Amino acid sequence: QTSAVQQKLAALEKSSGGRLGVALIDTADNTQVLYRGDERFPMCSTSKVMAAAAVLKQSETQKQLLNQPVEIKPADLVNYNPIAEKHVNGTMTLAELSAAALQYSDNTAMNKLIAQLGGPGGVTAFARAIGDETFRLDRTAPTLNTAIPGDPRDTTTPRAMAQTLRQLTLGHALGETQRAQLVTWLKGNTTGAASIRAGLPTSWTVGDKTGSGDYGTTNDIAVIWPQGRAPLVLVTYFTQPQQNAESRRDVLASAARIIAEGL
C-alpha cells in the first residue's frame, strides 16, 4: 500500500530530480513510515555514528580507552579536518576524536576511529554484532564519500540505519553510560540545523549526524524528542544523478516536515 505520507514524499522526490530514502520509527507504538526504505544509499559521514558507537562498545571493557592518546601526524590530514589540524605533531584522545567526528564531521578523526577498530571491516563487524545485516563500511575518509550510483561500498538502507540508530541511542546496544555519551554527542552536533531539524517544530529537540558527498549526496540521521511525545528516529538520505550536483539540505528538511505533519 501507498500512504498519504508516502504520496507526499514521492511528490517531493519528483520536484527534486534526485532519489530520496526515508525511514521513521515512532517509539510511541514502534510503527514505521518508509520511502525507498530497502534501497541502498551512500552513508557518507552518517557512518561516523557506527564508528563512534563501536569505540564506545570497546570502552565498556576498558575504563581508560576514551582517555587514550592517538598521535596526529601531518600525513594524517585529509580533505576536511578542522579539529585534527590543531593537534598535528600532538595527540587527540579517542573521546576528542569521537566528538570531532560526530559534532564537526572531522574526517581525520573518523579515520582514527576506523584505525582503532582495525579498519573499515571492524566498523562493519560491530554493525553485525548489534544485528545490522545491511550496513557496510568499505573505505576510509574521504573516499567513502564517492557516492557513485549503483556502488554497494559504504552503503546502507534507510530501514536498517533507523533500526540501528534506535538500538544505539534509545535501546541497549550500548551500556547506559555509553548510550548517554552517544546521545550527548549527537545533541551537540554543529552541522544539522539546515537538515532534519529545519523541517521540525522549534520546540522539538534533535540529535543528528549529517553527511555529504559526491552526486549531491545529502544525508541526515536523527533521534528526535518531540514536545509531549515519545522519541522518534528518522533517517533521510538523498542522492542525485550528476557527480557535481549541489547539496539539497532543504529536501531533507521538506521530508522531515512531511513526516512530522503525518504524526
- Which residues carry out catalysis? 45
What cell numbers appear for 5 in the block? 505520507
What cell numbers appear for 178 in the block? 555509553
20 close to 220: Cβ distance less than 8 angstroms? no
Measure the CA–CA gap between 86 and 92, rounded to whole angstroms.
10
Return the percent helix, strand and coil in the chain, to nearest 5: 45, 20, 35
Residues contacting 6, CB < 8 A, separation 6+: 33, 34, 35
From residue 26, alpha-carbon distances to 78, 113, 162, 165, 196 in Å are 38, 30, 10, 13, 15
Cis peptide before 42 (omega within 30 of 0): no
What cell numbers appear for 108 in the block? 581525520
76 half-sphere exposure, CB direction, 13 A CA radius: 27
